[PDB]
């Protein structure tokens, strides 16, 4: 089943690559890179880590079925089109990074993978053990031992934030990215609600060029700013802002809580008008 699956995915990605004849994330770059990695996986599987649910084989069954669905979406598409293709480029960027994180060189390391933030690392290994991936519903219940989310719109917004590959399952890599972006751990979901649900400056699933474009609407309003997850340095934020002369710049800040970075930038007079809006929310 697994070798057939890998063969099918590699062929779908070859078709897309041939049908796709810009700056990161770019499908034209990501398609052949993902197919090469899949080939590396396939070789390595024919010679594994801890067995059972959430292990290497389970991860690949899920990942490859999602990669097929996403590859069908791209195929079906080749202004609205520009957006649909940018969102899919971000999704493929995330699928490629997740497979590179968990099977570098084709060789599974999900049972050894270590999260960036120590409290989150501990939470995953104590709660999930050697597993590298969980279905959303099981993840939501496990995370709920520590950081419960309100069912409904809130929990669904959380799902959309965490699930980088839009697969319905949370890998240890996605949880690594989420807990870096929304650190610190003791207040994880309060940080996320304040920054990603309630803050006008937060944009999800936008590329560097899409924020450059969006902020042109506010170029006569120095101080205007937006923040969104970097697509090339996953786990870090990218803040776009209109400088004093009207130019649109983007910076990746220091590895610290985004709230501290935004508080400092407000106090220094750089991040004043979130998405160009008049009211900056209080983050204290």
């Amino acid at each position: 089943e697994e070798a057939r699956a890998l063969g099918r995915a590699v062929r779908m990605l070859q078709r897309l690559e041939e049908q796709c004849v810009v700056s990161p994330p770019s499908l034209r770059d990501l398609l052949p890179r993902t197919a090469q990695l899949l080939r590396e996986v396939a070789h390595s599987r024919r010679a594994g880590g801890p067995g059972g649910p959430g292990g290497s084989g389970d991860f690949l069954l899920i990942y490859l079925a999602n990669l097929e669905a996403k590859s069908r979406q791209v195929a079906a598409l080749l202004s609205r089109l520009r957006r649909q293709l940018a969102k899919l480029a971000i999704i493929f960027s995330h699928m490629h990074a997740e497979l590179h994180a968990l099977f570098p060189g084709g060789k599974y390391c999900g049972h050894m993978y270590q999260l960036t933030k120590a409290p989150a690392h501990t939470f995953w290994r104590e709660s999930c053990g050697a597993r590298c991936v969980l279905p959303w519903a099981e993840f939501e219940s496990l995370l709920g031992t520590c950081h419960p989310v309100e069912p409904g719109c809130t929990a669904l917004a959380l799902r959309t934030t965490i699930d980088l590959t839009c697969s319905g399952h949370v890998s240890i890599f996605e949880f690594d990215v989420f807990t870096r972006l929304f650190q610190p751990w003791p207040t994880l979901l309060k940080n996320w609600q304040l920054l990603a649900v309630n803050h006008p400056g937060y944009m999800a699933f936008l590329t560097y060029d899409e924020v450059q474009e969006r902020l042109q609407a506010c170029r006569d309003k120095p101080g205007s700013y937006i923040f969104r997850p970097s697509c090339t340095r996953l786990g870090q934020w990218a803040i776009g802002y209109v400088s004093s002369d009207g130019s649109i710049l983007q910076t990746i800040p220091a590895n610290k809580p985004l709230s501290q970075v935004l508080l400092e930038g407000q106090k220094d007079g750089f991040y004043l008008y979130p998405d160009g809006k008049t009211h900056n929310p209080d983050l204290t």
Binding site: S23, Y208, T232, L249, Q250, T251, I252
Partner: peptide, 5 residues
């Protein structure tokens, strides 16, 4: 992409 200090 160009990210500045």
């Amino acid at each position: 992409n160009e990210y500045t200090a």
